[PDB]
PDB file of C-alpha atoms and ligand atoms in Angstrom:
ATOM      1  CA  UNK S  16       0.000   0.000   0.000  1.00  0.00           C
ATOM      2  CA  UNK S  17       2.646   3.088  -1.063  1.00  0.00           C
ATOM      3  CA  UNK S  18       5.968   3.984  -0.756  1.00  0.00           C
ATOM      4  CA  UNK S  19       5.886   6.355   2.292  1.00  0.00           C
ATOM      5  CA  UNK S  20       6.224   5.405   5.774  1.00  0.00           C
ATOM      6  CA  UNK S  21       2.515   5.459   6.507  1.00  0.00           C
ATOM      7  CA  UNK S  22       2.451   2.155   3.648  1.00  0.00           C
ATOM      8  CA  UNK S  23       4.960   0.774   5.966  1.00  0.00           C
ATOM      9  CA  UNK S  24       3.273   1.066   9.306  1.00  0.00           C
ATOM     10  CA  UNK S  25      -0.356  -0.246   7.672  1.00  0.00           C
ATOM     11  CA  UNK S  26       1.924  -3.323   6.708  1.00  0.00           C
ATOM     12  CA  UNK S  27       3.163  -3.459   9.921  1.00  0.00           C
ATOM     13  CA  UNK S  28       7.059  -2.963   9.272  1.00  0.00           C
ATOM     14  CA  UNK S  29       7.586  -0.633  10.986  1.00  0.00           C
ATOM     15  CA  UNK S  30       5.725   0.196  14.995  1.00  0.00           C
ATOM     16  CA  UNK S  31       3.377   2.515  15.859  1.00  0.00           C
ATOM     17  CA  UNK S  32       0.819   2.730  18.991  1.00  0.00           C
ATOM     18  CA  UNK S  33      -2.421   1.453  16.922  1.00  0.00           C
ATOM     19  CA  UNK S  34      -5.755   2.957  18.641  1.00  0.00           C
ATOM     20  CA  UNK S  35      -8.200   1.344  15.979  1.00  0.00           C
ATOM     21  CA  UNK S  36      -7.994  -1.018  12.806  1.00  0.00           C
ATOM     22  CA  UNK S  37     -10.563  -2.015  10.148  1.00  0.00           C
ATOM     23  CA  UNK S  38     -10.211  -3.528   6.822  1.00  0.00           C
ATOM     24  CA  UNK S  39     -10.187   0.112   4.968  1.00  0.00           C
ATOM     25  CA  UNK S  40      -8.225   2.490   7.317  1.00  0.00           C
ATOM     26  CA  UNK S  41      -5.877   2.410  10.394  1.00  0.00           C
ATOM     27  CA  UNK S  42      -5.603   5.096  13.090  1.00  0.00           C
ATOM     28  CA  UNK S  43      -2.308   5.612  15.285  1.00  0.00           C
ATOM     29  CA  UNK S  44      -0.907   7.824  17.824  1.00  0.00           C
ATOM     30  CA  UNK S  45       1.248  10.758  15.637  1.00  0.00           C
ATOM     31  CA  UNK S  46       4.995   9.971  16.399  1.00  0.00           C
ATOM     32  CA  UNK S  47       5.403  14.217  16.311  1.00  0.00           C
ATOM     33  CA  UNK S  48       2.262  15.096  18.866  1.00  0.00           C
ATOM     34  CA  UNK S  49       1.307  18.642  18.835  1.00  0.00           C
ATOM     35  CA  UNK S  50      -1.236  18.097  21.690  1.00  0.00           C
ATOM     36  CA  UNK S  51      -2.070  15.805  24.738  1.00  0.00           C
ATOM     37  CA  UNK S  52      -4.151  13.784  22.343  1.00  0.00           C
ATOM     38  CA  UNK S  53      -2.530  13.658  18.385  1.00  0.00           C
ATOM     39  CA  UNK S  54      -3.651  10.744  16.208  1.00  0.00           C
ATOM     40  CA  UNK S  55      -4.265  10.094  12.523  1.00  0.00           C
ATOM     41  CA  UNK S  56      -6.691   8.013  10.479  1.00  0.00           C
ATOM     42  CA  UNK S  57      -5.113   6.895   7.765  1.00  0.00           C
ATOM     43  CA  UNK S  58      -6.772   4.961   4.202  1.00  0.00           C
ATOM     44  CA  UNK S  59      -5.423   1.953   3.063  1.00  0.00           C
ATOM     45  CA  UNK S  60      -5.546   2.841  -0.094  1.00  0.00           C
ATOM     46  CA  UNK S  61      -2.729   4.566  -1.248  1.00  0.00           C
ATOM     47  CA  UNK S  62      -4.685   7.822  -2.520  1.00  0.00           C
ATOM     48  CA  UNK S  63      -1.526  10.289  -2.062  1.00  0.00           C
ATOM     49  CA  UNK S  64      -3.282  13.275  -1.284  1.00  0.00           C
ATOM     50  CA  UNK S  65      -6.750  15.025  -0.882  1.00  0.00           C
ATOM     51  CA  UNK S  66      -6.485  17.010  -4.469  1.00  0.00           C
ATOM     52  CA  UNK S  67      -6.538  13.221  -5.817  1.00  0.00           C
ATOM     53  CA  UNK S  68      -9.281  11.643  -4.552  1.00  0.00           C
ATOM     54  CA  UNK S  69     -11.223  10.210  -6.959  1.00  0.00           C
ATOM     55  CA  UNK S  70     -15.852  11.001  -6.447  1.00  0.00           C
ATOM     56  CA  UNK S  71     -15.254   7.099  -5.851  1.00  0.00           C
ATOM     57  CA  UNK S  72     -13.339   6.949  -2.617  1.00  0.00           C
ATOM     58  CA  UNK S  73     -16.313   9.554  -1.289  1.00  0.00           C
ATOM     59  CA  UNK S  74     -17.295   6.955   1.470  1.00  0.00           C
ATOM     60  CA  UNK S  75     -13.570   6.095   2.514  1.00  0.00           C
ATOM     61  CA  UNK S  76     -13.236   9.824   2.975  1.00  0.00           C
ATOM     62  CA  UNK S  77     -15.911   9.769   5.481  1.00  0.00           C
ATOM     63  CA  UNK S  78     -15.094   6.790   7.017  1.00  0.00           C
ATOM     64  CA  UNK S  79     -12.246   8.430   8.295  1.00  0.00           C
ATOM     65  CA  UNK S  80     -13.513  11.009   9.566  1.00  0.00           C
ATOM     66  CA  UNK S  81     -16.157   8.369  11.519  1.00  0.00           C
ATOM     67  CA  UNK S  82     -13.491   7.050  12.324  1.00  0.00           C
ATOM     68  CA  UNK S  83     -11.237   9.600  13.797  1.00  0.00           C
ATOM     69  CA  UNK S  84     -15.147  10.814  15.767  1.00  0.00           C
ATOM     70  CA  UNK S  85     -14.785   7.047  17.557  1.00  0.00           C
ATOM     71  CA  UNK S  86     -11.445   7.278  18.341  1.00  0.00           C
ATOM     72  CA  UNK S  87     -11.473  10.973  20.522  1.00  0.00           C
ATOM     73  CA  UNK S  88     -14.518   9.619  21.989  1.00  0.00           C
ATOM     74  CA  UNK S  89     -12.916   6.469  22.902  1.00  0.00           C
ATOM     75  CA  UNK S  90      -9.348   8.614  23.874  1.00  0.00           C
ATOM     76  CA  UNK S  91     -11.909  11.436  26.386  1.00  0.00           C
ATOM     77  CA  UNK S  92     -11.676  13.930  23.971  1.00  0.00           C
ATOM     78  CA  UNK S  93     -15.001  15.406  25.612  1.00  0.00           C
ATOM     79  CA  UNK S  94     -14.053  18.529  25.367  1.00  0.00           C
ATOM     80  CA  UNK S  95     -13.516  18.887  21.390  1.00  0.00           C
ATOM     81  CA  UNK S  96     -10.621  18.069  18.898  1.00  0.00           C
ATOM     82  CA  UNK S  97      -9.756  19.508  16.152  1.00  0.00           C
ATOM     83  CA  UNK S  98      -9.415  17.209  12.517  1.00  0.00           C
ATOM     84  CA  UNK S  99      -6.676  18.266  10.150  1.00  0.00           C
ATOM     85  CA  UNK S 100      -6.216  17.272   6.362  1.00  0.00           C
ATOM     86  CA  UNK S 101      -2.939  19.063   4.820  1.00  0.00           C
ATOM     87  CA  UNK S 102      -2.778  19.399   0.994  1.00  0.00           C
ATOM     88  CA  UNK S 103       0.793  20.317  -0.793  1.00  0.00           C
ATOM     89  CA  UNK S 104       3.164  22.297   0.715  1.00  0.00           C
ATOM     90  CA  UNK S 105       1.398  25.158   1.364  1.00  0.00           C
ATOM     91  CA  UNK S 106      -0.401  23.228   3.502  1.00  0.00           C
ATOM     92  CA  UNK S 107       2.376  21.258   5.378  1.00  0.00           C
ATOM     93  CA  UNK S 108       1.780  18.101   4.309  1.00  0.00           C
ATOM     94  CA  UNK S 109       4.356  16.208   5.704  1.00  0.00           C
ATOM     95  CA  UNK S 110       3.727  12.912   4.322  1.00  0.00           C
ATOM     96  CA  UNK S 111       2.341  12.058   0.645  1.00  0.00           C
ATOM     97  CA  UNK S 112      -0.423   9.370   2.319  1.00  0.00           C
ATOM     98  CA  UNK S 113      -3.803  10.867   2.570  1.00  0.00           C
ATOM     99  CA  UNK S 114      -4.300  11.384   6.683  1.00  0.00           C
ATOM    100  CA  UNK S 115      -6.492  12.915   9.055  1.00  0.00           C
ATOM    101  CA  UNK S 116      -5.181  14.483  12.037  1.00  0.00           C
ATOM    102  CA  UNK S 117      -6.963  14.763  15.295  1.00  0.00           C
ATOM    103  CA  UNK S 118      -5.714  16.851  17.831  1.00  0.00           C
ATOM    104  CA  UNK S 119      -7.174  17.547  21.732  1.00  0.00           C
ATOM    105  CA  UNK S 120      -6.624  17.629  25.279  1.00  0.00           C
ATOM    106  CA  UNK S 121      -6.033  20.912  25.288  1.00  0.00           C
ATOM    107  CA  UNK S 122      -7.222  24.216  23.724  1.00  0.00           C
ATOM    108  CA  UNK S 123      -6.389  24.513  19.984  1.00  0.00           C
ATOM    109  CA  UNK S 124      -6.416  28.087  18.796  1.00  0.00           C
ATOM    110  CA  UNK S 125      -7.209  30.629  15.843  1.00  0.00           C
ATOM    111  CA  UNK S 126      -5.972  30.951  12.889  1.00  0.00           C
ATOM    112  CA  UNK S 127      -5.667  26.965  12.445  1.00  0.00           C
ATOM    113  CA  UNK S 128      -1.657  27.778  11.396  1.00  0.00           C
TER     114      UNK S 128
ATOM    115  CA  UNK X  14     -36.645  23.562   9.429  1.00  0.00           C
ATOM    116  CA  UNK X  15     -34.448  22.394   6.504  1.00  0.00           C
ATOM    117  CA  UNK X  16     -30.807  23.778   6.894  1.00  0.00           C
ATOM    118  CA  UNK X  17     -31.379  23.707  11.171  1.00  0.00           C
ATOM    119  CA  UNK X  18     -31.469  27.245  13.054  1.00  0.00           C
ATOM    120  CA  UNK X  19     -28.292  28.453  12.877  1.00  0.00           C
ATOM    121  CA  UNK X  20     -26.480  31.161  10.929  1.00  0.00           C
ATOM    122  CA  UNK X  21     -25.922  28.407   8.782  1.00  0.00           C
ATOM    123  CA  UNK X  22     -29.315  27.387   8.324  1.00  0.00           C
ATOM    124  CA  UNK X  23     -30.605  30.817   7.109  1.00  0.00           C
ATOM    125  CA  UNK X  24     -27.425  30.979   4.796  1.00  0.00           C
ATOM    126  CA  UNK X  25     -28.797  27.401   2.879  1.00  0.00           C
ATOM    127  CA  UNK X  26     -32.026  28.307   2.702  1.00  0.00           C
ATOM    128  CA  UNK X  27     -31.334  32.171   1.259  1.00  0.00           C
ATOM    129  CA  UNK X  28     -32.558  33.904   4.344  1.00  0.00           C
ATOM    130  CA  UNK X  29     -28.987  36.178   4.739  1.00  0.00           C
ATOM    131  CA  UNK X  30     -26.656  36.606   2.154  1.00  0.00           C
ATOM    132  CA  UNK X  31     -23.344  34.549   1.465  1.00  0.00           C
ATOM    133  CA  UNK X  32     -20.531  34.519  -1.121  1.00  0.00           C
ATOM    134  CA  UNK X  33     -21.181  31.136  -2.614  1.00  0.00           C
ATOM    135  CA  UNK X  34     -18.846  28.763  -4.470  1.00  0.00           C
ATOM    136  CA  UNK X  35     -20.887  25.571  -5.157  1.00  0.00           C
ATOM    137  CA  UNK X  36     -24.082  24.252  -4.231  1.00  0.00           C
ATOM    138  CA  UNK X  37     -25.752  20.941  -4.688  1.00  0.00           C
ATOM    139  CA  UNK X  38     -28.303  19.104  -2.705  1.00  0.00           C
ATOM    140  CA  UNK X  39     -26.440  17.774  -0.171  1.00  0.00           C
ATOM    141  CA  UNK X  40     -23.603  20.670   0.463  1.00  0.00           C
ATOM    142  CA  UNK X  41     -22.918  24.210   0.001  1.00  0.00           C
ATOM    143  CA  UNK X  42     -19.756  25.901  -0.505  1.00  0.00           C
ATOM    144  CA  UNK X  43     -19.152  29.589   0.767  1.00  0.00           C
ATOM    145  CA  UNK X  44     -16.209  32.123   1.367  1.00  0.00           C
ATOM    146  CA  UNK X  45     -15.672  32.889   5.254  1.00  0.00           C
ATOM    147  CA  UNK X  46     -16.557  36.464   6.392  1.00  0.00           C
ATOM    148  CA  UNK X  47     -13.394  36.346   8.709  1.00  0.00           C
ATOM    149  CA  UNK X  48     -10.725  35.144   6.088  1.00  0.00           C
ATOM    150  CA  UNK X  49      -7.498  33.901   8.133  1.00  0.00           C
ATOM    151  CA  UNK X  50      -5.998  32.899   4.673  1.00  0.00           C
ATOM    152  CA  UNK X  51      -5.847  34.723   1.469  1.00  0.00           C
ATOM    153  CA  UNK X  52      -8.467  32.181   0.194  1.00  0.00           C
ATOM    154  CA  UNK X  53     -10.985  30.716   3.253  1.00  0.00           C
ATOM    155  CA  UNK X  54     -14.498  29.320   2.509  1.00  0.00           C
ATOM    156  CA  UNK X  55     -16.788  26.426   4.368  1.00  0.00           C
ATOM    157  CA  UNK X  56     -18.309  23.677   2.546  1.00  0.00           C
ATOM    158  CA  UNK X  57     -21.491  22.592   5.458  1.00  0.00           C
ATOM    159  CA  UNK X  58     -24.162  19.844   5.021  1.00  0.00           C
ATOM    160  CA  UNK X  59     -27.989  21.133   3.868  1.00  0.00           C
ATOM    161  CA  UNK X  60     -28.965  18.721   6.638  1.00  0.00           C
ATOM    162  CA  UNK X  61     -28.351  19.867  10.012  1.00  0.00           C
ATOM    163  CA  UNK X  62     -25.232  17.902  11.687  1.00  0.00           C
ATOM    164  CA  UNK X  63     -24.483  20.143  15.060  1.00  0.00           C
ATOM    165  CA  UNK X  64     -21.249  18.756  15.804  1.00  0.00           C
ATOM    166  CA  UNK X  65     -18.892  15.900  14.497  1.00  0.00           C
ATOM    167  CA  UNK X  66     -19.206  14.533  17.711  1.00  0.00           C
ATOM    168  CA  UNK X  67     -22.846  13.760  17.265  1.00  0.00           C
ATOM    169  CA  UNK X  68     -22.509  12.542  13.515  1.00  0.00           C
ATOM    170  CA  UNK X  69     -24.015   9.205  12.614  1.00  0.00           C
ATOM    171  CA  UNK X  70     -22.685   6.213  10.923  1.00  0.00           C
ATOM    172  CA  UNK X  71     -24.839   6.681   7.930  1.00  0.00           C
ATOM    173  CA  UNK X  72     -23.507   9.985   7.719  1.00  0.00           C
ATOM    174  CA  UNK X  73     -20.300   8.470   6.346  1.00  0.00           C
ATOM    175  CA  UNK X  74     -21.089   9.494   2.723  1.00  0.00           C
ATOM    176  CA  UNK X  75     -22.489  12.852   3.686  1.00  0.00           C
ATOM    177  CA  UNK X  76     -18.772  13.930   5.232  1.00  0.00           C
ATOM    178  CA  UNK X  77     -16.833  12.309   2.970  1.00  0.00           C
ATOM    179  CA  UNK X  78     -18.773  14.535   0.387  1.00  0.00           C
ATOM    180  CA  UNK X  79     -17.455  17.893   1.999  1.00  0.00           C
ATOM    181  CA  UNK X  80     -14.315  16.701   1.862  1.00  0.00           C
ATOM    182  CA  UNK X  81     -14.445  16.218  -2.040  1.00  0.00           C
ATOM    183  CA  UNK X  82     -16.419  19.343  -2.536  1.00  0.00           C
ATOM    184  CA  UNK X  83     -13.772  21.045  -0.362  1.00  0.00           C
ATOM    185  CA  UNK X  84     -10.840  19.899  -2.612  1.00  0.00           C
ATOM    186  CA  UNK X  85     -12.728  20.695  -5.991  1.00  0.00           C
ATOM    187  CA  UNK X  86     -13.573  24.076  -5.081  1.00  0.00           C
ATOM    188  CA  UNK X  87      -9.942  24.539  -3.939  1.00  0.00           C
ATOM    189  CA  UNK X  88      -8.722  23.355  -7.157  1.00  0.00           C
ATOM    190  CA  UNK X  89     -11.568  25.864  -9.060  1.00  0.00           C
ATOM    191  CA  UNK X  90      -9.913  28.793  -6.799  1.00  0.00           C
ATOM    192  CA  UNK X  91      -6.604  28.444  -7.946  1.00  0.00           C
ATOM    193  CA  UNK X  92      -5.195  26.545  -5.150  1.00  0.00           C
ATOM    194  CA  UNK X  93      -2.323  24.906  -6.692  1.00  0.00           C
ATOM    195  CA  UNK X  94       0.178  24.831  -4.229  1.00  0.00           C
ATOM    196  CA  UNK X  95      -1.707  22.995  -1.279  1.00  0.00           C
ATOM    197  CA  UNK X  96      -4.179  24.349   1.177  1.00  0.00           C
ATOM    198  CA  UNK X  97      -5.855  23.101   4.547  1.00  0.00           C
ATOM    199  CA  UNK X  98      -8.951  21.304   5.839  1.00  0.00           C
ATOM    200  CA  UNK X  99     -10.249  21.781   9.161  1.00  0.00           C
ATOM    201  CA  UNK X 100     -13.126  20.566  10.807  1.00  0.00           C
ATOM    202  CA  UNK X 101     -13.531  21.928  14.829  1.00  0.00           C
ATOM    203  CA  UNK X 102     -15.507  20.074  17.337  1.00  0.00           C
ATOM    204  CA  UNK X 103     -16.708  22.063  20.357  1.00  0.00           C
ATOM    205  CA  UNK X 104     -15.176  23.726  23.217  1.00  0.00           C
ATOM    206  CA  UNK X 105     -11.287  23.218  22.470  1.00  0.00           C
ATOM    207  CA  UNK X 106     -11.796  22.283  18.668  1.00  0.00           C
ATOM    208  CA  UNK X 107     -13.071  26.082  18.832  1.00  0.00           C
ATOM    209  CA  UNK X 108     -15.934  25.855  16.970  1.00  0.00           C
ATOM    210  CA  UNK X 109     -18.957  28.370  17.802  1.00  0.00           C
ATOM    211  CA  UNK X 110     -21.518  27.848  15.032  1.00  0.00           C
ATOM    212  CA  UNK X 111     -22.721  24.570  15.818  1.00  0.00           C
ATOM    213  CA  UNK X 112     -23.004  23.135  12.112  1.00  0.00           C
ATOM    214  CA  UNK X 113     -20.913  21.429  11.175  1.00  0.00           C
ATOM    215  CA  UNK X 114     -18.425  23.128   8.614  1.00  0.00           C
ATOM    216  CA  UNK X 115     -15.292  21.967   7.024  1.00  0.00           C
ATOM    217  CA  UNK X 116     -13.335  25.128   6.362  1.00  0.00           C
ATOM    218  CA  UNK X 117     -10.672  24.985   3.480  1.00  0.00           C
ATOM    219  CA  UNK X 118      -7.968  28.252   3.714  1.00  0.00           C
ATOM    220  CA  UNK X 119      -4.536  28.627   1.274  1.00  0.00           C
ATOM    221  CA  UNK X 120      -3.078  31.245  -0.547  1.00  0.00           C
ATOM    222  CA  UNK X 121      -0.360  31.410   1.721  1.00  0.00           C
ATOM    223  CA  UNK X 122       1.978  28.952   3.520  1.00  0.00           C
ATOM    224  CA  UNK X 123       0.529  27.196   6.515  1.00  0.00           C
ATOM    225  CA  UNK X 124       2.309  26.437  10.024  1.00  0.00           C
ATOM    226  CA  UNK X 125       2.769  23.945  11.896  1.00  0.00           C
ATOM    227  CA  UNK X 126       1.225  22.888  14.605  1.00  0.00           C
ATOM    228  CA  UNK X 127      -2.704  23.800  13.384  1.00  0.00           C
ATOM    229  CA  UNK X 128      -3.523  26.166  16.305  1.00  0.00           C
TER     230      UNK X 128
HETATM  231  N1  LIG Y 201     -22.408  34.902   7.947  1.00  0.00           N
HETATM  232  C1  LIG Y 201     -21.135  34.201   7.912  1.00  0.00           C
HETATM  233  N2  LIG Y 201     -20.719  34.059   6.663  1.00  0.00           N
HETATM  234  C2  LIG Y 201     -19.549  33.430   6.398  1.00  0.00           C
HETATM  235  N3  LIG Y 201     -18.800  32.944   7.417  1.00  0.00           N
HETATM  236  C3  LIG Y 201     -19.220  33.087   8.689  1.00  0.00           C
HETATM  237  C4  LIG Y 201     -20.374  33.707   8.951  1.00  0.00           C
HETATM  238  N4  LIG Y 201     -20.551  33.711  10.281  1.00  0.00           N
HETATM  239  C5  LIG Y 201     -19.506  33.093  10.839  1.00  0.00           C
HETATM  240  N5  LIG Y 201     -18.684  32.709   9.859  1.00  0.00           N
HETATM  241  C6  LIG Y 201     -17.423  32.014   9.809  1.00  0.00           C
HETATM  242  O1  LIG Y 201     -17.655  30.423   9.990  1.00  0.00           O
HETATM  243  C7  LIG Y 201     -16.595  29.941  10.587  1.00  0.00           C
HETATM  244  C8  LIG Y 201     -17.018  29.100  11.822  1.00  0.00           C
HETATM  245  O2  LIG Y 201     -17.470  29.953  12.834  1.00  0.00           O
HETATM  246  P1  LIG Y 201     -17.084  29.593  14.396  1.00  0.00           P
HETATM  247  O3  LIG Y 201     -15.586  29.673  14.576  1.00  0.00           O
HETATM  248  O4  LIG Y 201     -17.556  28.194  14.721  1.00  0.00           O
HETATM  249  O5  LIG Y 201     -17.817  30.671  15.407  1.00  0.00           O
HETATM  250  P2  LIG Y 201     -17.823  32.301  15.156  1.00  0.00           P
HETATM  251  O6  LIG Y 201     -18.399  32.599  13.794  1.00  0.00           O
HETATM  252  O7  LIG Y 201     -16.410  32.826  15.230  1.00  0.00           O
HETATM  253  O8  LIG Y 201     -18.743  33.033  16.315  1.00  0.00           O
HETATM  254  P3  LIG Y 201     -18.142  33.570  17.755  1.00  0.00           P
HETATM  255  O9  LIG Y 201     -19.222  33.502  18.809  1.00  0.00           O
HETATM  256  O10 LIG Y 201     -16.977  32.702  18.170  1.00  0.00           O
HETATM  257  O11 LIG Y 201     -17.632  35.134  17.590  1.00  0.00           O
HETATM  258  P4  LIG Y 201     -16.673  35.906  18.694  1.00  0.00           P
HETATM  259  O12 LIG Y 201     -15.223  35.694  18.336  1.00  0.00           O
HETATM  260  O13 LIG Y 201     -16.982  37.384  18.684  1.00  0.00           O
HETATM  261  O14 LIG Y 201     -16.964  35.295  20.200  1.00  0.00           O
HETATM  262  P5  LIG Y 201     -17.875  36.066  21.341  1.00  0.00           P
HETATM  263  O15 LIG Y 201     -17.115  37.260  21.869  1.00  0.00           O
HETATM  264  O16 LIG Y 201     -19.172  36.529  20.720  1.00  0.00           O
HETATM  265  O17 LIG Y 201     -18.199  35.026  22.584  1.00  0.00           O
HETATM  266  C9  LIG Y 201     -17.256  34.033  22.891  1.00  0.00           C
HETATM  267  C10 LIG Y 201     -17.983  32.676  23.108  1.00  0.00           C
HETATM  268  O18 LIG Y 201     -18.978  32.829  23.946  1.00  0.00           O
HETATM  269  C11 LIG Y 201     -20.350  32.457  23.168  1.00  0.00           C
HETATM  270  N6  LIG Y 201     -21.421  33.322  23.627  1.00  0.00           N
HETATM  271  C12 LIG Y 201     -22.057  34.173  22.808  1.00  0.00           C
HETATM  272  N7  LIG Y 201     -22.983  34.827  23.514  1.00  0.00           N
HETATM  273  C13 LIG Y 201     -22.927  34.384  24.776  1.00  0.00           C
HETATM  274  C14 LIG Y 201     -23.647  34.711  25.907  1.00  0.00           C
HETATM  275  N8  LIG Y 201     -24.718  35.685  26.017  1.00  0.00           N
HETATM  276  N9  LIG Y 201     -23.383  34.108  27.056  1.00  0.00           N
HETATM  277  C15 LIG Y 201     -22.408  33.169  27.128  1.00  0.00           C
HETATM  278  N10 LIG Y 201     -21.700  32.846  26.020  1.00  0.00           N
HETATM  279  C16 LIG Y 201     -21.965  33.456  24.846  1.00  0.00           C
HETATM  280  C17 LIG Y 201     -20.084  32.585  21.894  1.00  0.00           C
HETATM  281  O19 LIG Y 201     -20.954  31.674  21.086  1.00  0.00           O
HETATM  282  C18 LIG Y 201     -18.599  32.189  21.782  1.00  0.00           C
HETATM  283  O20 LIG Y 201     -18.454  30.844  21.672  1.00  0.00           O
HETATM  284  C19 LIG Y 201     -15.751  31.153  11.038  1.00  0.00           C
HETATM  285  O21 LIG Y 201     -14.626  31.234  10.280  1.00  0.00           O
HETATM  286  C20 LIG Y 201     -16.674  32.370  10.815  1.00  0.00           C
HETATM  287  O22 LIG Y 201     -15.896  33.604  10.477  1.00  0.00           O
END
């Protein structure tokens, strides 16, 4: 599933501290956490970034995003999160594997970077 | 009522004005009055979602649909070098207009971390 690093923790080469796993998408603790609570959801698929997605994958896209809504319930995100998808380099996208970011646990501010 | 009672609401069904990008019947696309990026708009569900916290599995579809909207409407405005998607969920997420939105901003570079 891809040539980044995110293809090689989905087939399990490398570690990372797994929160949630399903046969479409994977969701880990961020190695680089920016917040109490950091963790992406992850396709998959190897769709290398948002711009793209294909109408198709419409559904995976949302799963995600289900996904990531489990997860900072499951983590005590009661208090909000904030979900992150990063497009290109203007947009700091640090890793050429579509990914949501959630971030909580503590108060995440305005403007979004 | 269809659209829910919020700000957003009245913006879907035409009740106060908005700077619109796209509009289909599911989602509606619409520049931010309080631009933190050289480009900044919202793509929100027609049907009322309050929070992401409170979205439902058969919603799956619905979200991944903003998402796609969000990325073709970037790509219509000239976003060529990257942009990003945000989606805030309550108190800390700071969101205050409880509909849910995905906001899309570029134009410039982004930092790092996202608020
Ligand atoms: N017509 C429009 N067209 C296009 N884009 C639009 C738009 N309207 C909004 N947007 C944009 O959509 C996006 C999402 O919006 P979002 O970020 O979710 O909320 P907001 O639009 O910024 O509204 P705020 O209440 O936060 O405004 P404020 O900063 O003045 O806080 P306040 O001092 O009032 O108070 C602070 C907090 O206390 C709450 N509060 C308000 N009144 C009371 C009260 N009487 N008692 C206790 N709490 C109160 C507030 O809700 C708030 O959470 C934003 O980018 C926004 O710019």
């Amino acid at each position: 599933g891809g040539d980044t690093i995110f293809g090689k923790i989905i087939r399990k080469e490398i570690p990372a501290k797994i929160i949630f796993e399903d046969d479409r998408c994977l969701a880990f603790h961020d190695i680089s956490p920016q917040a109490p609570t950091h963790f992406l959801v992850i396709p998959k698929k190897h769709i290398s970034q948002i711009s793209v997605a294909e109408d198709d994958d419409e559904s995976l896209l949302g799963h995600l995003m289900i996904v990531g809504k489990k997860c900072a319930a499951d983590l005590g995100l009661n208090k909000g999160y904030r979900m992150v998808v990063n497009e290109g380099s203007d947009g700091g996208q640090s890793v050429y594997h579509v990914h949501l970011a959630v971030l909580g646990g503590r108060q995440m501010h305005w403007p979004p970077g």
